[PDB]
Swiss-Prot record, chain A:
Any Pfam family the entry gives: Prot_ATP_ID_OB_C
Function recorded in the entry: Component of the 26S proteasome, a multiprotein complex involved in the ATP-dependent degradation of ubiquitinated proteins. This complex plays a key role in the maintenance of protein homeostasis by removing misfolded or damaged proteins, which could impair cellular functions, and by removing proteins whose functions are no longer required. Therefore, the proteasome participates in numerous cellular processes, including cell cycle progression, apoptosis, or DNA damage repair.
Domain of life of the organism encoding this protein: Eukaryota
UniProt gene name: PSMC3
Name assigned to this protein: 26S proteasome regulatory subunit 6A
From Swiss-Prot, chain B:
Protein's recorded name: 26S proteasome regulatory subunit 10B
Oligomer status and interactors: Component of the 19S proteasome regulatory particle complex. The 26S proteasome consists of a 20S core particle (CP) and two 19S regulatory subunits (RP). The regulatory particle is made of a lid composed of 9 subunits, a base containing 6 ATPases including PSMC6 and few additional components. Interacts with PAAF1.
Source organism superkingdom: Eukaryota
Binding residues for ATP: G111, P112, P113, G114, T115, G116, K117, T118
Alphabetized UniProt keyword annotations: Acetylation, ATP-binding, Cytoplasm, Nucleotide-binding, Nucleus, Phosphoprotein, Proteasome
Modified residue annotations for N6-acetyllysine: K62, K143
Family: Belongs to the AAA ATPase family.
InterPro entries assigned to the protein according to its UniProt record, in alphabetical order: 26S_Proteasome_ATPase, AAA+_ATPase, AAA_lid_3, ATPase_AAA_core, ATPase_AAA_CS, NA-bd_OB-fold, P-loop_NTPase, Prot_ATP_ID_OB_2nd
Protein species of origin: Homo sapiens
From Swiss-Prot, chain C:
Transmembrane segments: none
A GO MF label: protein homodimerization activity
One GO process term, biological-process aspect: proteasome-mediated ubiquitin-dependent protein catabolic process
Disulfide bond sites: none
Gene that specifies this protein: PSMD7
Its job: Component of the 26S proteasome, a multiprotein complex involved in the ATP-dependent degradation of ubiquitinated proteins. This complex plays a key role in the maintenance of protein homeostasis by removing misfolded or damaged proteins, which could impair cellular functions, and by removing proteins whose functions are no longer required. Therefore, the proteasome participates in numerous cellular processes, including cell cycle progression, apoptosis, or DNA damage repair.
Protein name: 26S proteasome non-ATPase regulatory subunit 7
Gene source species: Homo sapiens
Lineage, highest ranks first: Eukaryota, Metazoa, Chordata, Craniata, Vertebrata
Residues of the full protein shown: 5 to 100 of 324
Similarity comment text for this entry: Belongs to the peptidase M67A family.
Length: 339, 313, 96
């Protein structure tokens, strides 16, 4: 063991290094305390001909452009064209980059969002990618908007509102800005839940290509399909879509990353109306007389918002009816009251 | 007694030499921290642009902020990058120059029977593409007066400035009265920017469609799309090859017949057959088992493949 | 390796300080100073330097007194305030 006696000096040098890094590692808190302003970063690869080529283009908030190479600590998610980065008074170095900005269905919604995050072990053991796009289509009456948003609130994760008129803006070019923004919060921030609705109305493919806004909504929408079919790593936040009609369905939605789990929900018959309406009345005071037969039959061509309005109208006259519990005939009274 | 002390001392020396790897690996990163701390010392640089040069040694610069200045020549750099027309960088002290700042042919694959040739472009792009530049057919809406000429010259101009350029056109049947005037405009611009002194060795494009009656007889003319290949038989040998070299990481039942799965899933592509087998894996992962009975496999082939055949409009 | 070097007068005026802070003791031997510079580039450029207690013997010439702790402390603090310059060599004021 005479040859292994030199290891003690190596360990003394290592512990001496750990004892001497406290100063230069301690000044990080007083030098890199807080960036007082915010500056935008745009990536631009340079070439010097070590003497290696590496630089970046900076843009301050005060509309002043300066020069600085790619510097800082070990970068993993950095080097992207983002904002809200670290900057000192005048050195203008990069130190800290930060991103700027219920009963009848519980299986398909909860699984499709948990398995691409928790079941990675079975993904590595089987080599199978999970489905991404789910299409809650079918005739109206199910209430996919209020029930799908309510179940998205029951997912206990982050929820981001995104509708039709949200992406469609008065100016041009903003659609891709809100797509890269929904991918900023969703893709860049924590995994959130985004539910859009009425995709069939904007998925119109006309023959006369002279006047159709829905084809610019197919430029932003098919640009999202470019950012899903073109971008293989779709393991992050998915795109959940739903339509109220099967009149004009986009044929280019046939992909695992795209809308694959197209679950057909038919007209809300006594069973389905008893399901979504048992959800709508699973907590309120329901008297032991609501057979749901006549009132579930009279709910024809009534969406979940209009059926919720029927529940409100049932919640209107029961005050003056004298009974503190909602009765059977008050549902059909609300139906015949709205229409 | 004596023979065991060599093995024992070999064990103490072993556990003594197995503890250096837990530190010597992170000491390189710790030293890299001070290396970066010494690398963040070059600060205070600004940018500029050169328009007019009077003296070969001293020229005029144009800052982004708006005020203009004049700088000299540094002893390290040469007159190669000193020529005008190249964006350079400056320093706050003495306005010295550290370095500069750089600014920033056809094939038709259509099949008269069936659809899914866009998924064939997904098969080729998923096989060997190495150049990401996608153009969607829904960007030529032309709801304005009609000026897509500068859109074509600017798009192919960005294809000249950007070396990676392999396009995959699709869904051209719906965009193919004056409905044909814009097609002759954009197509004659394609000839005007493909038959002249254009970099045909770098640009590449693949046009796809869905119907054999809307084949755009203007596009059927040679020139634009010279290499034309029909899809009547979806390359059963190449389909079987894609299934073989793409059926590696996916584990299935022991008794598996490739010819039956190939024959029962035809018409579209072999990569779509790969989507049928990975769909059968997407159901085998729902059945929390590695290998299952081929009944569910035949449910993914028949139900999923026939669902592609029915919903492939 | 090195074709030419660049020496600033600041180190020689620091030798003037070496001749100023003597205190009239009567020794005035070859005070050795730790020369600093930039060895990164091919050309050598001296910016500043410091001193180290150096004393020899009258009869025996092989006697030389240096210090490692003072060199690592002056180099540590000087490197902390200015990391662009590191140790390169030394220099003595003796003509022989």
């Amino acid at each position: 063991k005479i040859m292994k006696s030199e290891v003690l000096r190596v360990t003394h040098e290592l512990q001496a290094m750990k004892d001497k890094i406290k100063e230069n590692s301690e000044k990080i808190k007083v030098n890199k305390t807080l960036p007082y302003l915010v500056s935008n970063v745009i990536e631009l690869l340079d070439v010097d001909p070590q003497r290696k080529g590496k630089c970046a283009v900076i843009k301050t908030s005060t509309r002043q452009t300066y020069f600085l190479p790619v510097i800082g600590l070990v970068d993993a998610e950095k080097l992207k064209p983002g904002d809200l980065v670290g900057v000192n008074k005048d050195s203008y170095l990069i130190l800290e980059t930060l991103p700027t900005e219920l009963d009848k269905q519980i299986q398909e919604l909860v699984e499709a969002i948990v398995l691409p995050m928790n079941h990675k072990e079975k993904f590595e053991n089987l080599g199978i990618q999970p489905p991404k796009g789910v299409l809650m289509y079918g005739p109206p009456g199910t209430g996919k908007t209020l029930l799908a948003r309510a179940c998205a609130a029951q997912t206990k994760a982050t929820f981001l509102k995104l509708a039709g008129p949200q992406l469609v803006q008065m100016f041009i070019g903003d659609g891709a800005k809100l797509v890269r923004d929904a991918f900023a919060l969703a893709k860049e921030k924590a995994p959130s839940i985004i539910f859009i609705d009425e995709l069939d109305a904007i998925g119109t493919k006309r023959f006369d290509s002279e006047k159709a806004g829905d084809r610019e909504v197919q430029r932003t929408m098919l640009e999202l399909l470019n950012q899903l079919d073109g971008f293989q790593p779709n393991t992050q936040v998915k795109v959940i879509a739903a339509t109220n009609r099967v009149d004009i369905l986009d044929p280019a939605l046939l992909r695992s990353g795209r809308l694959d789990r197209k679950i057909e929900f038919p007209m809300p018959n006594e069973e389905a109306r008893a399901r979504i309406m048992q959800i709508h009345s699973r907590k309120m005071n329901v008297s032991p007389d609501v057979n749901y037969e006549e009132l579930a039959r009279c709910t024809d061509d009534f969406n979940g918002a209009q059926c919720k309005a029927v529940c409100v109208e049932a919640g209107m006259i029961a005050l003056r009816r004298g009974a503190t519990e909602l009765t059977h005939e008050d549902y059909m009274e609300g139906i015949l009251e709205v229409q | 007694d004596y023979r065991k002390k060599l093995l024992e001392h070999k064990e103490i020396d072993g556990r003594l030499k197995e503890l250096r790897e837990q530190l010597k690996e992170l000491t390189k990163q710790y030293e890299k921290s001070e290396n970066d701390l010494k690398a963040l010392q070059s600060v205070g640089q600004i940018v500029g642009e050169v328009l007019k040069q009077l003296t070969e040694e001293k020229f005029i610069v144009k800052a982004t902020n708006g005020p203009r200045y004049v700088v000299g020549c540094r002893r390290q750099l040469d007159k190669s990058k000193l020529k005008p027309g190249t964006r350079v960088a400056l320093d706050m002290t003495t306005l010295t120059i550290m370095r500069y700042l750089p600014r920033e042919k056809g094939c038709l694959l259509y099949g008269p029977p069936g659809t899914g040739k866009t998924l064939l472009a997904r098969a080729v792009a998923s096989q060997l593409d190495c150049n990401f530049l996608k153009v969607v057919s829904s960007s030529i809406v032309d709801k304005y007066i009609g000026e897509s000429a500068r859109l074509i010259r600017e798009m192919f101009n960005y294809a000249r400035d950007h070396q990676p350029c392999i396009i995959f056109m699709d869904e051209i049947d719906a965009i193919g009265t004056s409905a044909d005037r814009e097609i002759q405009r954009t197509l004659m611009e394609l000839l005007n920017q493909m038959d002249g002194f254009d970099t045909l060795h770098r640009v590449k494009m693949i046009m796809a469609t869905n119907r054999p009656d809307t084949l755009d007889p203007a596009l059927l003319r040679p020139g634009r799309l010279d290499r034309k290949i029909h899809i009547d038989l979806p390359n059963e040998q190449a389909r079987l090859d894609i299934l073989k070299i793409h059926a590696g990481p996916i584990t299935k039942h022991g008794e598996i017949d490739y010819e039956a799965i190939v024959k029962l899933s035809d018409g579209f592509n072999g990569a779509d057959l790969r989507n049928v087998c990975t769909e059968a894996g997407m159901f085998a992962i729902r059945a929390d088992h590695d290998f299952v009975v081929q009944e569910d496999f035949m449910k993914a082939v028949r139900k999923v493949a026939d669902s592609k055949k029915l919903e492939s409009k | 390796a090195v074709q030419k070097v660049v020496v600033h007068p600041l180190v020689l005026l620091s030798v003037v300080d070496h001749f100023n802070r003597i205190g009239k003791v009567g020794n005035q031997k070859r005070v050795v100073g730790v020369l600093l510079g930039s060895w990164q580039k091919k050309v050598l450029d001296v910016s500043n330097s410091f001193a180290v207690p150096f004393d020899e013997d009258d009869k025996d010439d092989s006697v030389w007194f240096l210090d490692h702790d003072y060199l690592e402390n002056m180099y540590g603090m000087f490197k902390k305030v200015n990391a662009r310059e590191r140790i390169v060599g030394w220099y003595h004021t003796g003509p022989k």
